Amino acid sequence: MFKLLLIFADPAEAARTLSLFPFSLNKENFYTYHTENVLLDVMVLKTWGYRGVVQALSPPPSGYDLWINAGFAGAANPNIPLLKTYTITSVKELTPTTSVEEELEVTPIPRLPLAQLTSVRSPYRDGFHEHLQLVDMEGFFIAKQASLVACPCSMIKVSSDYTTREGQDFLKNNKVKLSQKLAEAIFPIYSSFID
Amino acid sequence: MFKLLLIFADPAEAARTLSLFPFSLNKENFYTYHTENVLLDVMVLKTWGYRGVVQALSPPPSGYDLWINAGFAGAANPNIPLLKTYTITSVKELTELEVTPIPRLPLAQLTSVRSPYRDGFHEHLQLVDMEGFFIAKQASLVACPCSMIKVSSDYTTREGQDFLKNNKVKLSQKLAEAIFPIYSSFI
Ligand SMILES: Nc1ncnc2[nH]cnc12
Protein backbone atom coordinates (compact mmCIF):
# COMPACT_ATOMS: atom_id res chain seq x y z
CA MET A 1 0.00 0.00 0.00
CA PHE A 2 1.49 3.28 -1.24
CA LYS A 3 1.28 6.20 1.19
CA LEU A 4 1.46 9.70 -0.31
CA LEU A 5 1.60 12.88 1.79
CA LEU A 6 0.68 16.18 0.17
CA ILE A 7 1.92 19.31 1.96
CA PHE A 8 0.54 22.77 1.20
CA ALA A 9 1.71 25.98 2.86
CA ASP A 10 -1.78 27.41 3.31
CA PRO A 11 -5.47 26.75 2.67
CA ALA A 12 -5.62 28.69 -0.61
CA GLU A 13 -2.94 26.48 -2.14
CA ALA A 14 -4.72 23.29 -0.94
CA ALA A 15 -8.30 24.17 -1.83
CA ARG A 16 -8.70 22.71 -5.33
CA THR A 17 -6.73 19.53 -4.51
CA LEU A 18 -8.99 19.01 -1.49
CA SER A 19 -11.95 19.16 -3.91
CA LEU A 20 -10.53 16.41 -6.19
CA PHE A 21 -11.13 13.53 -3.78
CA PRO A 22 -13.72 12.89 -1.04
CA PHE A 23 -11.31 13.57 1.83
CA SER A 24 -12.41 13.34 5.45
CA LEU A 25 -10.93 15.00 8.51
CA ASN A 26 -9.45 12.40 10.83
CA LYS A 27 -9.20 12.51 14.63
CA GLU A 28 -5.65 13.91 14.27
CA ASN A 29 -7.10 17.02 12.57
CA PHE A 30 -5.82 16.50 9.02
CA TYR A 31 -7.33 15.26 5.75
CA THR A 32 -7.20 11.67 4.55
CA TYR A 33 -8.54 9.57 1.67
CA HIS A 34 -7.78 6.03 0.55
CA THR A 35 -8.72 3.75 -2.32
CA GLU A 36 -7.22 0.61 -3.82
CA ASN A 37 -3.56 0.47 -2.72
CA VAL A 38 -3.13 4.24 -2.12
CA LEU A 39 -3.42 6.34 1.01
CA LEU A 40 -3.55 10.06 0.23
CA ASP A 41 -3.13 12.45 3.17
CA VAL A 42 -3.06 16.25 3.12
CA MET A 43 -1.45 18.57 5.64
CA VAL A 44 -1.66 22.38 5.53
CA LEU A 45 1.14 24.16 7.35
CA LYS A 46 -0.33 27.58 8.18
CA THR A 47 -4.05 27.58 8.90
CA TRP A 48 -3.78 30.06 11.77
CA GLY A 49 -1.82 33.16 12.56
CA TYR A 50 0.60 35.40 10.75
CA ARG A 51 3.35 32.81 10.29
CA GLY A 52 4.04 29.12 10.10
CA VAL A 53 5.90 27.52 12.99
CA VAL A 54 8.55 24.82 13.01
CA GLN A 55 6.21 22.40 14.84
CA ALA A 56 4.01 22.23 11.74
CA LEU A 57 6.36 19.44 10.54
CA SER A 58 8.45 18.69 13.63
CA PRO A 59 8.67 15.83 14.36
CA PRO A 60 8.23 15.04 10.68
CA PRO A 61 5.42 12.64 9.75
CA SER A 62 6.74 9.08 9.58
CA GLY A 63 5.72 6.17 7.40
CA TYR A 64 4.95 7.76 4.02
CA ASP A 65 6.52 6.60 0.74
CA LEU A 66 6.65 10.02 -0.93
CA TRP A 67 5.99 13.62 0.05
CA ILE A 68 4.85 16.20 -2.50
CA ASN A 69 4.99 19.87 -1.57
CA ALA A 70 2.68 21.75 -3.93
CA GLY A 71 2.36 25.52 -3.76
CA PHE A 72 2.50 28.97 -5.22
CA ALA A 73 5.82 30.59 -6.09
CA GLY A 74 6.87 34.04 -7.19
CA ALA A 75 8.75 34.47 -10.47
CA ALA A 76 11.89 36.56 -10.06
CA ASN A 77 12.92 36.34 -13.73
CA PRO A 78 10.59 37.81 -16.40
CA ASN A 79 11.27 34.77 -18.63
CA ILE A 80 9.02 32.65 -16.39
CA PRO A 81 5.39 33.02 -17.51
CA LEU A 82 2.74 33.12 -14.81
CA LEU A 83 0.18 30.33 -14.25
CA LYS A 84 2.80 27.75 -15.27
CA THR A 85 3.47 24.60 -13.23
CA TYR A 86 7.06 23.46 -12.64
CA THR A 87 8.76 20.67 -10.82
CA ILE A 88 11.83 21.55 -8.75
CA THR A 89 15.34 20.18 -9.14
CA SER A 90 16.89 21.84 -6.11
CA VAL A 91 15.73 24.20 -3.39
CA LYS A 92 17.90 26.66 -1.53
CA GLU A 93 17.15 28.52 1.66
CA LEU A 94 18.58 32.01 1.59
CA THR A 95 19.20 34.29 4.62
CA PRO A 96 19.44 37.80 3.13
CA THR A 97 21.10 39.48 6.14
CA THR A 98 24.13 37.18 5.91
CA SER A 99 23.90 35.81 2.34
CA VAL A 100 24.35 32.34 3.83
CA GLU A 101 22.60 29.58 1.90
CA GLU A 102 21.79 25.90 2.17
CA GLU A 103 20.65 23.80 -0.77
CA LEU A 104 19.06 20.37 -1.24
CA GLU A 105 18.19 18.39 -4.33
CA VAL A 106 14.61 17.27 -4.68
CA THR A 107 13.12 14.55 -6.83
CA PRO A 108 11.59 15.91 -10.08
CA ILE A 109 8.09 14.89 -11.12
CA PRO A 110 7.89 13.35 -14.63
CA ARG A 111 6.55 15.44 -17.52
CA LEU A 112 6.77 18.76 -15.68
CA PRO A 113 9.31 21.38 -16.76
CA LEU A 114 12.28 21.90 -14.50
CA ALA A 115 13.04 24.89 -12.28
CA GLN A 116 15.13 25.96 -9.31
CA LEU A 117 13.50 27.24 -6.14
CA THR A 118 14.70 29.63 -3.43
CA SER A 119 12.86 29.77 -0.10
CA VAL A 120 12.88 32.97 1.95
CA ARG A 121 11.06 34.00 5.12
CA SER A 122 9.64 37.32 4.06
CA PRO A 123 7.50 37.86 0.94
CA TYR A 124 9.82 38.70 -1.94
CA ARG A 125 8.88 42.01 -3.58
CA ASP A 126 12.34 43.54 -4.12
CA GLY A 127 12.27 43.12 -7.89
CA PHE A 128 13.77 40.89 -10.52
CA HIS A 129 17.05 39.08 -10.01
CA GLU A 130 19.81 37.69 -12.18
CA HIS A 131 20.17 34.36 -10.35
CA LEU A 132 16.69 33.58 -9.02
CA GLN A 133 13.97 31.61 -10.76
CA LEU A 134 11.05 30.67 -8.50
CA VAL A 135 10.71 31.96 -4.91
CA ASP A 136 8.54 30.57 -2.11
CA MET A 137 8.63 30.35 1.70
CA GLU A 138 8.30 26.74 2.87
CA GLY A 139 9.94 24.53 0.23
CA PHE A 140 13.37 24.21 1.81
CA PHE A 141 11.93 23.60 5.28
CA ILE A 142 9.78 20.80 3.91
CA ALA A 143 12.60 19.16 1.91
CA LYS A 144 14.87 19.25 4.94
CA GLN A 145 12.25 17.70 7.22
CA ALA A 146 11.68 14.97 4.61
CA SER A 147 15.40 14.12 4.85
CA LEU A 148 14.94 13.32 8.57
CA VAL A 149 12.61 10.37 7.80
CA ALA A 150 14.50 9.32 4.66
CA CYS A 151 11.43 9.90 2.58
CA PRO A 152 11.75 11.16 -1.02
CA CYS A 153 10.34 14.66 -1.56
CA SER A 154 9.07 16.20 -4.78
CA MET A 155 7.82 19.71 -5.41
CA ILE A 156 5.21 21.26 -7.70
CA LYS A 157 5.30 25.06 -7.87
CA VAL A 158 3.00 27.23 -9.99
CA SER A 159 4.19 30.72 -10.91
CA SER A 160 1.84 33.03 -9.02
CA ASP A 161 3.21 36.57 -9.30
CA TYR A 162 6.22 38.55 -10.40
CA THR A 163 8.24 39.50 -7.34
CA THR A 164 7.41 43.24 -7.36
CA ARG A 165 5.02 45.37 -5.32
CA GLU A 166 2.67 45.82 -8.30
CA GLY A 167 2.84 42.11 -9.07
CA GLN A 168 1.24 41.06 -5.82
CA ASP A 169 -2.30 41.93 -6.98
CA PHE A 170 -2.18 39.03 -9.47
CA LEU A 171 -1.57 36.57 -6.62
CA LYS A 172 -4.38 38.19 -4.63
CA ASN A 173 -6.88 37.83 -7.47
CA ASN A 174 -6.00 34.43 -8.97
CA LYS A 175 -5.77 32.05 -5.99
CA VAL A 176 -8.51 29.72 -7.35
CA LYS A 177 -6.87 29.43 -10.79
CA LEU A 178 -3.46 28.87 -9.21
CA SER A 179 -4.76 26.23 -6.79
CA GLN A 180 -6.48 24.50 -9.72
CA LYS A 181 -3.15 24.21 -11.59
CA LEU A 182 -1.72 22.44 -8.56
CA ALA A 183 -4.65 20.01 -8.49
CA GLU A 184 -4.27 19.26 -12.21
CA ALA A 185 -0.58 18.45 -11.74
CA ILE A 186 -1.15 16.24 -8.69
CA PHE A 187 -3.73 13.97 -10.31
CA PRO A 188 -1.50 12.10 -12.84
CA ILE A 189 0.98 11.48 -10.01
CA TYR A 190 -1.70 9.94 -7.78
CA SER A 191 -2.91 7.91 -10.75
CA SER A 192 0.53 6.46 -11.54
CA PHE A 193 0.70 4.79 -8.10
CA ILE A 194 -2.57 2.89 -8.47
CA ASP A 195 -1.66 -0.80 -8.78
CA MET B 1 -10.43 26.91 -28.19
CA PHE B 2 -11.65 23.32 -27.82
CA LYS B 3 -15.24 22.94 -26.64
CA LEU B 4 -16.27 19.84 -24.66
CA LEU B 5 -19.80 18.94 -23.55
CA LEU B 6 -20.21 16.39 -20.75
CA ILE B 7 -23.66 14.88 -20.17
CA PHE B 8 -24.71 13.04 -16.97
CA ALA B 9 -28.15 11.53 -16.39
CA ASP B 10 -28.46 12.45 -12.72
CA PRO B 11 -26.77 14.56 -10.05
CA ALA B 12 -25.31 11.65 -8.07
CA GLU B 13 -23.45 10.38 -11.14
CA ALA B 14 -22.19 13.91 -11.87
CA ALA B 15 -21.29 14.95 -8.33
CA ARG B 16 -17.60 14.04 -8.20
CA THR B 17 -16.89 15.34 -11.73
CA LEU B 18 -18.43 18.65 -10.73
CA SER B 19 -15.97 18.77 -7.80
CA LEU B 20 -13.01 18.65 -10.22
CA PHE B 21 -13.23 22.26 -11.45
CA PRO B 22 -14.52 25.61 -10.12
CA PHE B 23 -17.52 25.54 -12.43
CA SER B 24 -20.01 28.39 -12.71
CA LEU B 25 -23.74 27.59 -12.82
CA ASN B 26 -25.17 29.13 -15.98
CA LYS B 27 -28.71 27.86 -15.34
CA GLU B 28 -30.39 24.85 -13.81
CA ASN B 29 -28.22 21.79 -14.24
CA PHE B 30 -25.80 23.52 -16.67
CA TYR B 31 -22.25 24.20 -15.44
CA THR B 32 -19.43 25.92 -17.32
CA TYR B 33 -15.67 26.19 -16.90
CA HIS B 34 -12.98 27.52 -19.14
CA THR B 35 -9.33 28.26 -19.49
CA GLU B 36 -7.83 29.95 -22.53
CA ASN B 37 -7.66 26.77 -24.62
CA VAL B 38 -10.61 24.68 -23.37
CA LEU B 39 -14.29 25.23 -22.66
CA LEU B 40 -15.83 22.50 -20.50
CA ASP B 41 -19.61 22.48 -20.11
CA VAL B 42 -21.58 19.96 -18.07
CA MET B 43 -25.28 19.16 -18.52
CA VAL B 44 -27.16 17.05 -15.96
CA LEU B 45 -30.46 15.70 -17.22
CA LYS B 46 -33.57 16.54 -15.18
CA THR B 47 -34.92 12.97 -15.43
CA TRP B 48 -33.54 9.65 -16.62
CA GLY B 49 -33.63 7.83 -19.94
CA TYR B 50 -34.99 8.85 -23.32
CA ARG B 51 -37.47 11.35 -21.83
CA GLY B 52 -34.63 13.19 -20.10
CA VAL B 53 -32.47 13.19 -23.22
CA VAL B 54 -35.32 14.63 -25.32
CA GLN B 55 -36.04 17.28 -22.70
CA ALA B 56 -32.40 18.43 -22.47
CA LEU B 57 -30.94 17.80 -25.94
CA SER B 58 -33.75 18.62 -28.37
CA PRO B 59 -32.69 20.80 -30.03
CA PRO B 60 -29.14 19.48 -29.72
CA PRO B 61 -26.52 22.13 -28.86
CA SER B 62 -24.28 23.02 -31.79
CA GLY B 63 -20.75 24.30 -31.53
CA TYR B 64 -19.00 21.63 -29.46
CA ASP B 65 -16.01 19.65 -30.68
CA LEU B 66 -16.85 16.52 -28.61
CA TRP B 67 -19.71 15.23 -26.47
CA ILE B 68 -18.98 12.79 -23.63
CA ASN B 69 -21.78 10.91 -21.89
CA ALA B 70 -20.52 9.60 -18.56
CA GLY B 71 -22.57 7.42 -16.23
CA PHE B 72 -23.32 4.25 -14.32
CA ALA B 73 -24.07 1.11 -16.34
CA GLY B 74 -25.33 -2.35 -15.52
CA ALA B 75 -23.21 -5.40 -16.30
CA ALA B 76 -25.17 -8.12 -18.14
CA ASN B 77 -22.34 -10.71 -18.24
CA PRO B 78 -20.74 -12.08 -15.05
CA ASN B 79 -17.32 -11.79 -16.71
CA ILE B 80 -17.52 -8.00 -16.36
CA PRO B 81 -16.38 -6.92 -12.87
CA LEU B 82 -18.12 -4.10 -11.07
CA LEU B 83 -16.41 -0.76 -10.22
CA LYS B 84 -14.61 -0.83 -13.58
CA THR B 85 -14.57 2.15 -15.96
CA TYR B 86 -15.08 1.36 -19.64
CA THR B 87 -15.21 3.38 -22.84
CA ILE B 88 -17.81 2.46 -25.45
CA THR B 89 -17.19 1.38 -29.04
CA SER B 90 -20.79 0.98 -30.22
CA VAL B 91 -24.30 1.49 -28.85
CA LYS B 92 -27.61 -0.13 -29.76
CA GLU B 93 -31.18 0.03 -28.55
CA LEU B 94 -32.45 -3.22 -27.01
CA THR B 95 -35.95 -2.56 -28.38
CA GLU B 96 -26.70 0.65 -33.83
CA LEU B 97 -24.20 3.57 -33.76
CA GLU B 98 -20.42 3.74 -33.55
CA VAL B 99 -19.05 5.60 -30.55
CA THR B 100 -15.57 7.14 -30.36
CA PRO B 101 -13.38 5.38 -27.72
CA ILE B 102 -11.53 7.41 -25.10
CA PRO B 103 -7.86 6.34 -25.04
CA ARG B 104 -6.37 4.11 -22.40
CA LEU B 105 -9.68 2.72 -21.15
CA PRO B 106 -11.04 -0.81 -21.40
CA LEU B 107 -13.49 -1.32 -24.25
CA ALA B 108 -17.13 -2.38 -24.15
CA GLN B 109 -20.35 -2.31 -26.13
CA LEU B 110 -23.46 -0.62 -24.76
CA THR B 111 -27.16 -1.42 -24.96
CA SER B 112 -29.68 1.28 -24.03
CA VAL B 113 -33.02 0.21 -22.55
CA ARG B 114 -36.23 2.02 -21.60
CA SER B 115 -36.64 0.37 -18.16
CA PRO B 116 -34.25 -0.94 -15.48
CA TYR B 117 -32.85 -4.17 -16.93
CA ARG B 118 -32.89 -7.05 -14.40
CA ASP B 119 -33.35 -10.02 -16.78
CA GLY B 120 -30.03 -11.58 -15.80
CA PHE B 121 -27.33 -12.63 -18.22
CA HIS B 122 -29.42 -14.57 -20.78
CA GLU B 123 -28.43 -12.46 -23.77
CA HIS B 124 -25.28 -11.44 -25.61
CA LEU B 125 -25.20 -8.11 -23.77
CA GLN B 126 -22.30 -6.32 -22.07
CA LEU B 127 -23.04 -2.94 -20.44
CA VAL B 128 -26.62 -1.69 -20.15
CA ASP B 129 -27.81 1.91 -19.58
CA MET B 130 -30.79 4.14 -20.42
CA GLU B 131 -29.38 7.28 -22.16
CA GLY B 132 -26.40 6.53 -24.36
CA PHE B 133 -28.12 5.51 -27.60
CA PHE B 134 -30.35 8.57 -27.48
CA ILE B 135 -27.44 10.91 -26.70
CA ALA B 136 -25.38 9.47 -29.58
CA LYS B 137 -28.39 10.04 -31.87
CA GLN B 138 -28.58 13.70 -30.83
CA ALA B 139 -24.82 14.18 -31.34
CA SER B 140 -25.16 12.82 -34.88
CA LEU B 141 -27.73 15.53 -35.66
CA VAL B 142 -25.00 18.17 -35.11
CA ALA B 143 -22.23 16.10 -36.72
CA CYS B 144 -20.34 16.04 -33.42
CA PRO B 145 -18.15 13.15 -32.27
CA CYS B 146 -19.53 11.36 -29.23
CA SER B 147 -17.63 9.36 -26.60
CA MET B 148 -18.98 7.54 -23.59
CA ILE B 149 -17.53 6.56 -20.22
CA LYS B 150 -19.56 3.91 -18.40
CA VAL B 151 -18.60 2.46 -15.00
CA SER B 152 -20.03 -0.92 -14.11
CA SER B 153 -22.36 -0.21 -11.20
CA ASP B 154 -24.53 -3.32 -10.76
CA TYR B 155 -25.24 -6.73 -12.20
CA THR B 156 -28.50 -6.98 -14.15
CA THR B 157 -30.01 -9.41 -11.62
CA ARG B 158 -32.78 -8.72 -9.12
CA GLU B 159 -31.83 -6.28 -6.32
CA GLY B 160 -28.53 -5.58 -8.13
CA GLN B 161 -29.12 -1.86 -7.58
CA ASP B 162 -28.05 -2.40 -3.98
CA PHE B 163 -24.42 -2.41 -5.09
CA LEU B 164 -24.94 0.83 -7.00
CA LYS B 165 -26.67 2.51 -4.03
CA ASN B 166 -23.90 1.42 -1.62
CA ASN B 167 -21.11 2.54 -3.97
CA LYS B 168 -22.47 5.83 -5.35
CA VAL B 169 -19.50 7.92 -4.22
CA LYS B 170 -16.87 5.47 -5.45
CA LEU B 171 -18.66 5.06 -8.77
CA SER B 172 -19.07 8.81 -9.29
CA GLN B 173 -15.38 9.27 -8.40
CA LYS B 174 -14.40 6.65 -10.99
CA LEU B 175 -16.14 8.74 -13.64
CA ALA B 176 -14.40 11.90 -12.40
CA GLU B 177 -10.99 10.20 -12.55
CA ALA B 178 -11.60 9.14 -16.14
CA ILE B 179 -12.80 12.66 -17.11
CA PHE B 180 -10.03 14.73 -15.49
CA PRO B 181 -7.29 13.58 -17.93
CA ILE B 182 -9.55 14.10 -20.98
CA TYR B 183 -9.76 17.76 -20.06
CA SER B 184 -5.97 17.84 -19.90
CA SER B 185 -5.75 16.22 -23.35
CA PHE B 186 -6.92 19.53 -24.85
CA ILE B 187 -4.41 21.84 -23.16
N1 LIG C 1 -29.26 -2.47 -14.58
C1 LIG C 1 -29.35 -1.34 -15.29
N2 LIG C 1 -30.24 -1.26 -16.30
C2 LIG C 1 -30.32 -0.13 -17.01
N3 LIG C 1 -29.63 1.00 -16.86
C3 LIG C 1 -28.75 0.89 -15.85
N4 LIG C 1 -27.87 1.85 -15.40
C4 LIG C 1 -27.20 1.29 -14.35
N5 LIG C 1 -27.58 0.06 -14.08
C5 LIG C 1 -28.56 -0.20 -15.03
List the strand order in the largest sheet of chain A.
5-9-8-6-10
The bound ligands are: adenine
Biggest interface pair, residues each?
A-B, 13 and 13 residues
Radius of gyration of chain A: 16 Å
User: What percentage of residues of chain A falls in helices of 4 or more residues?
Assistant: 10-25%
Per CATH, the architecture of chain A is 3-Layer(aba) Sandwich
List the total number of helices of chain A. Answer: 4
Question: What is the CATH fold-level name of chain A?
Answer: Rossmann fold
Whole-number count of domains of chain A: 1
Please report the first level of CATH classification, the CATH class of chain A. Alpha Beta
Q: What's the count of strands of chain A?
A: 10
CATH superfamily of chain A: Nucleoside phosphorylase domain
Instruction: Name the structural class of chain A.
Output: alpha/beta
Strand/helix succession of chain A: EHEEEEEEEEHEHH
Distance between the amino and carboxyl termini of chain A: 9 Å
What characterizes the major β-sheet of chain A?
5 strands, mixed, barrel
